[PDB]
Design a protein around this ligand. Sequence first.
Ligand SMILES: C=C(C)[C@]12C[C@@H](C)[C@@]34O[C@](Cc5ccccc5)(O[C@@H]1[C@@H]3C=C(COC(=O)Cc1ccc(O)c(OC)c1)C[C@]1(O)C(=O)C(C)=C[C@@H]41)O2
Ligand SMILES: CCCCCCCCCCCCCCCC(=O)O[C@H](COC(=O)CCCCCC)COP(=O)(O)OCCN
Ligand SMILES: CCCCCCCCCCCCCCCC(=O)O[C@H](COC(=O)CCCCCC)COP(=O)(O)OCCN
Lengths: 72, 536, 80
Amino acid sequence: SYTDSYYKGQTALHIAIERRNMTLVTLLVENGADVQAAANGDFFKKTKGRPGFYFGELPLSLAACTNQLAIV
Amino acid sequence: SYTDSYYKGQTALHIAIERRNMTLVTLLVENGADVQAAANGDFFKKTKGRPGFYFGELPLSLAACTNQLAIVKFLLQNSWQPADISARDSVGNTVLHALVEVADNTVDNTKFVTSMYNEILILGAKLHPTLKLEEITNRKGLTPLALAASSGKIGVLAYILQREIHEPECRHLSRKFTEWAYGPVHSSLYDLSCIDTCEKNSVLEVIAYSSSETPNRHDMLLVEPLNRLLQDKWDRFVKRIFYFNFFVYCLYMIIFTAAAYYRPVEGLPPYKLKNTVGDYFRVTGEILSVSGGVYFFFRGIQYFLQRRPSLKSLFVDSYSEILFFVQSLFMLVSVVLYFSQRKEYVASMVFSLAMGWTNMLYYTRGFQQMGIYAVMIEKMILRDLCRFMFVYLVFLFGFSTAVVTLIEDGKYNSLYSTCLELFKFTIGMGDLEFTENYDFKAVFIILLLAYVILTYILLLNMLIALMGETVNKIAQESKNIWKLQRAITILDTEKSFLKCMRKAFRSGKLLQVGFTPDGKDDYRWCFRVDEVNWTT
Amino acid sequence: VYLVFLFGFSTAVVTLIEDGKYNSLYSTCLELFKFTIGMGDLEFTENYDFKAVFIILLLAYVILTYILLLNMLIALMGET
Ligand SMILES: C=C(C)[C@]12C[C@@H](C)[C@@]34O[C@](Cc5ccccc5)(O[C@@H]1[C@@H]3C=C(COC(=O)Cc1ccc(O)c(OC)c1)C[C@]1(O)C(=O)C(C)=C[C@@H]41)O2
Ligand SMILES: CCCCCCCCCCCCCCCC(=O)O[C@H](COC(=O)CCCCCC)COP(=O)(O)OCCN
Ligand SMILES: CCCCCCCCCCCCCCCC(=O)O[C@H](COC(=O)CCCCCC)COP(=O)(O)OCCN
């Protein structure tokens, strides 16, 4: 996962869910990918004076937030 | 070609291109027709008080302007007589300047002009990869971008600043570079070149020092890269320097007030010092006050030389510099009378002192909430009182002369005291005490009551209603007004800067593309912006 | 805004006058405040020096504060 101060904890599954790739999500979960990682960098936390995207830091919350019921 | 003063230089090719007749254009160009003729009659030049059609005087510009892409391609790409994409007219305008000028900020026109602009750029890149059309300046020194900003072309400006061409081999024509995107967020780099550091005439200078007649003067600062730039410059350096200047002005005015209050009351200036503490503090304050006056005098002169404002718009813009300059003039006249041994220097000094306090309202602008009061006061003085002054003076001089003629030997047999009394009646603090027993008392009473009804009741409330609508008109325009004033402050702070510092740039001199048409790389002073958009 | 105007003209007037009822910041600030709300005097029966400058200053104050600023406040309050 990303180790920097901004994208900390982001992994492949978050990108796959964001990109709306059902197949890659299935492949990652099949290969033992963690479905309960926390993506908890400054880009992903609640904030007012900064651009960002808060979603709850978890792939399940991300899939729900982006309106992808099938992945949920 | 036409030989008269109106259609001078027009030829068949111009008519054919206007007629959208591809066949005639093909025939004429085939027969050796000059594709770089100049049509430079009065019908074809830039003009304000005359109907006309300016297009840049050349067939290529005409073909682009009328939305005939095919003829542009044919003129540039046919071998019989190729057209010079870089040609300039008498004004110095290239085709891109011509396209900028014939914008009008409507949806359909913006689509037409923007599209033709972009296609001309692609054709230029393919035909002449070593040519940079957008840097070519017309006779006023303006590039197409500077010209678009100058004329208030919001659509063309918003297009150019946010230009992104998703095509290989011509990405160097882009200015916006989307580095990445997430759900609602995306990050791009903006080119920034000749926005802030241009060395001829940058975008922000042109928007700020526009003449207040440009239609979209405030809207042009809402376009994304500019707004973020101004916010960054404000938060980094300009904010602290602004507060420091305001504090120093406050100290200056306190010193001036204290120096003025404790003036000596004996006769015949200049006044010699005594070896005492009070005189040393007083003369110290006097020296500092006069120094400040000299400083404002020279700043005003530098302003009027650098800007060269015309008489018509002298007050419409530059109101603040005028008032600061007039304050300094009162100070200098006071010094001249002081050493010239006249007590009447006091009469000058107090005026400067009064003005010195009210010019504090200059510093309220640049605040979102408080700048509205300074803006309103400026506009009400310049438009409502100044128009109303003539109407009120007609009434005042009429009834004053009537009353003074009627009266023989009273307090009303003098134009000065009579004008004072009627003025007081206008603002509701007269008397109407008819205790005197002069002749023509009935006529005197009828005249005064007619005056009081006409001026206190009718005219004054008319003025107040008009001022009320002016106040309501610009209550809702507050945000725009604030933004523009903050921009002007930032530019002036960069101009003076008083510390040998020229850290006017925002982000680094980073490689943008690295792939020119040739084997070099471009470093362009890009600026990173991450935006949020909740669409879908 | 109002205090900027008031302190400006109050200090100017007090500096101009030597030994009157206007040679005091307290009474002068009171008088100019009364002028703002339309219950002053404008009685120039006194015969001190610089009478013309005193008159011009007070009339400029009365136009700027009683006519211009006060009705600006009233228009804004009316919209609220
Ligand atoms: C040169 C001009 C235009 C001007 C200079 C003087 C004489 C002025 O009166 C006027 C004429 C006048 C006189 C009396 C009532 C209304 C207008 O308007 C201004 C000018 C107008 C004002 C009005 O008060 C202000 O709010 C000043 C001001 C407004 C907005 C600003 O952005 C500002 O920043 C510099 C200053 C202040 C005076 O300069 C002042 O302090 C005195 C003693 C008279 C006012 O002449
Ligand atoms: C709001 C919009 C509508 C406004 C309507 C206006 C109404 C104003 C009220 C009337 C005011 C009358 C003024 C007082 C009359 C007066 O006191 O004076 C009269 C002299 O004649 C006049 O002035 C004629 C009256 C003026 C004509 C009319 C404008 C008689 O003389 P004496 O003083 O010696 O009285 C004898 C000794 N005590
Ligand atoms: C509604 C918006 C438009 C507003 C327009 C404003 C018009 C107001 C006109 C009022 C003018 C009042 C003139 C004062 C005359 C006066 O009373 O003072 C004179 C000296 O004149 C001056 O003050 C200088 C001129 C002042 C000019 C000031 C603009 C000396 O007379 P005495 O003392 O010897 O009187 C001897 C017997 N008592």
